[PDB]
Structure 1
Amino acid sequence: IVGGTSASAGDFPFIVSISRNGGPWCGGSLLNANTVLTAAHCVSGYAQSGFQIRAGSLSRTSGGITSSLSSVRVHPSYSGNNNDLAILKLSTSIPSGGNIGYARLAASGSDPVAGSSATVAGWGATSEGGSSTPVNLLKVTVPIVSRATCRAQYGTSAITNQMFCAGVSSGGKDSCQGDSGGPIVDSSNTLIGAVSWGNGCARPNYSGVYASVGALRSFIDTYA
């Protein structure tokens, strides 16, 4: 997260950190005791044995409850930047309670409205290409950017109806490398997306791009 602040205990109670080969990798959202939602690009094409999830801790390295993966399912239309969600099934169930909870999801057919406030969180770098990643969770608040504006930034075909955008025009606030897969929530605390892609991080005139839960809800519901 670039331009963010420290999360407090009990913020984002559904968030999980996801390590790969013992090192930082991405974020995700706990949907229920045995299911995590992340970005497809975090898991597609990699050995599943490399991953570990951690829930219930501000730290990505210690505390909380861990699990390995039992299975991975990517959206059936995932390709590159598009339809960038995956469902992970956990080998060890994680109960809600204390600083662990489950996400509430945006409705099928919903789309975030331009100018509304959203909050994104993760353990990614605090600068593009950053040489070290924080141990403790960060968060930042950014407004939704209309799909039309985002298409003017990236190209018409580049931003699909399964993506939405968020950021500040002058830059400075964004999700970054290592934040992929983690949650972006709306002003009701409903999970509206997962960190997906962008042109660098926090650049003026290049919004962060997020996979839309509303748009991909039927997939989520099938496998959650």
Structure 2
Amino acid sequence: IVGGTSASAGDFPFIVSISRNGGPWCGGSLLNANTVLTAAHCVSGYAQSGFQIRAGSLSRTSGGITSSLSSVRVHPSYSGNNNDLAILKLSTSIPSGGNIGYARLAASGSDPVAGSSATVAGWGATSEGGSSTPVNLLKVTVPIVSRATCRAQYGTSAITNQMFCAGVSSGGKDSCQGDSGGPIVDSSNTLIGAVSWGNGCARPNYSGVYASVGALRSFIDTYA
């Protein structure tokens, strides 16, 4: 996260860190005791056993409850950056309570409205190409950018009906590498997306692009 502040305990009861090979990698969202939602690109085709989920902590490396993976399922229409969601099943069930809870999802068919506030969180870099990453979870609030404006930035084909965008024209506030798969929420803390892709991080006039939960509820609902 670029331009962020430290998340407080319980800000995102459902957020998980996804370590890979013992190191930082991605974020995700705990949907129920045995299921995490993340970005497909975080997991597709990689060795499953390299991943470890942690819930209930502001750190990636201690606190809360861990699990390995039992299975990975990417969206059936995943292609390039499009439809960038995956369902992970956990080898260890994670109970709600305390600072752990399960995500509530954006309604099917919903689409975040330009100008509304959104908050994104993760353990990723604090600058584009940064090598260091924070111990504790960061968050940042950015407005939704209309799909039309986002298509002006990236091209028409590049931004689909299963993506939405968020950021500020001046840049300086965004998700970045290592934040992929983690949550973006609306102002009510309802999960509206997963961190997906963008041109660099926090660049002027290049929004962050998010996989849209509202557009992808059939997949999520079927397999969660």
SS across alignment from 2:220: helix
Paired position in structure 2 for 1:30: 30
1:189 Cα deviation from its structure 2 partner:
1.1
**Separation in 2 of the partners of 1:153 and 1:144?**
14
1:21 Cα deviation from its structure 2 partner:
0.6
**Separation in 1 of the partners of 2:9 and 2:213?**
25
**Separation in 2 of the partners of 1:9 and 1:106?**
22
SS across alignment from 1:17: strand
1:187 Cα deviation from its structure 2 partner:
1.0
**Separation in 2 of the partners of 1:46 and 1:39?**
13
**Separation in 2 of the partners of 1:187 and 1:3?**
18
Q: TM-score, normalised by structure 2?
A: 0.99
SS across alignment from 2:148: helix
SS across alignment from 1:220: helix
SS across alignment from 2:76: coil
Aligned runs of 1:82-161 on 2, under 5 Å? 82-161=82-161
1:129 Cα deviation from its structure 2 partner:
0.6
1:180 Cα deviation from its structure 2 partner:
0.1
1:126 Cα deviation from its structure 2 partner:
0.0
1:87 Cα deviation from its structure 2 partner:
0.2
1:131 Cα deviation from its structure 2 partner:
1.5
CA deviation map 1:159-212 (0-9, x unaligned): 000000000000000000000000000011110000000000000000000000
**Separation in 1 of the partners of 2:107 and 2:12?**
19
**Number of aligned pairs?**
224
**Separation in 2 of the partners of 1:47 and 1:80?**
19
Q: TM-score, normalised by structure 1?
A: 0.99
**Separation in 2 of the partners of 1:148 and 1:10?**
34
**Separation in 1 of the partners of 2:160 and 2:57?**
34
**Separation in 2 of the partners of 1:188 and 1:140?**
15
Paired position in structure 1 for 2:56: 56
CA deviation map 1:26-83 (0-9, x unaligned): 0000000000000000000101000000000000111110000000000000012100
1:108 Cα deviation from its structure 2 partner:
1.1
- Runs of 5+ in structure 1 lacking a partner? none
1:107 Cα deviation from its structure 2 partner:
1.1
- Runs of 5+ in structure 2 lacking a partner? none
1:153 Cα deviation from its structure 2 partner:
0.2
CA deviation map 1:77-105 (0-9, x unaligned): 00121000000000000000000000000
**Separation in 1 of the partners of 2:69 and 2:126?**
28
RMSD: 0.4
CA deviation map 1:99-145 (0-9, x unaligned): 00000001111100000000000000000111211110000000000
1:156 Cα deviation from its structure 2 partner:
0.5
User: 4+ runs of 1 displaced by more than 3 Å?
Assistant: none
**Separation in 1 of the partners of 2:95 and 2:78?**
30
